[PDB]
Amino acid sequence: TREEIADRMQHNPLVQAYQQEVMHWCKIVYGNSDVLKEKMQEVLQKPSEGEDLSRQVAENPTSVHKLAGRNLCGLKTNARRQAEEGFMHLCQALDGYTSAVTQAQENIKHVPQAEARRYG
Numbered sequence: 001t002r003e004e005i006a007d008r009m010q011h012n013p014l015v016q017a018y019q020q021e022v023m024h025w026c027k028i029v030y031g032n033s034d035v036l037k038e039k040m041q042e043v044l045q046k047p048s049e050g051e052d053l054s055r056q057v058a059e060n061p062t063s064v065h066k067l068a069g070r071n072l073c074g075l076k077t078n079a080r081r082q083a084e085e086g087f088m089h090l091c092q093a094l095d096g097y098t099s100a101v102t103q104a105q106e107n108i109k110h111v112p113q114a115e116a117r118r119y120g
Contacts, residue, residue: 005108006044008115012104015044018097025090029061029083031068036094043098047105050098058091 009015019040027033036057043050057064069079076084108115 002045005105008108009044009101009104011118011120012100013120014100015097015104018093018100021093022090022097025086025093026065028086029068029090030065031079031083032065035065040097043101047098047102050101054091054094054098057094061087061090 022036022040023033026035036053039053043053061067067080068083069077069081071077071080
């Protein structure tokens with residue numbers, strides 16, 4: 001069932017939309033859109049780890065990947081300036097993703113008949 005729930009949540013519109021959003025901002029902040037792909041899949045299997053993933057990126061972003069571009073003694077290259085600017089959006093997108101996953105798991109457990117009727 002838990003594996004089935006994650007199967008349903010794969011197609012959830014909000015889950016998909018935020019997932020794509022996270023990848024966009026990973027590309028900007030980290031220079032690589034795939035950096036959080038695996039962990040986002042892992043959160044589908046265990047939504048309770050979503051909060052952890054969110055905090056790790058927000059409070060220790062370089063534990064995940066190096067920041068795009070370079071900061072040379074205070075001179076930020078364009079890619080780095082865009083990374084810094086995009087960091088807030090990456091955290092929002094990720095908060096959005098993990099909350100949507102948690103919110104989806106709950107409403108599937110609350111009213112499965114309604115999820116059966118989604119067909120999308």
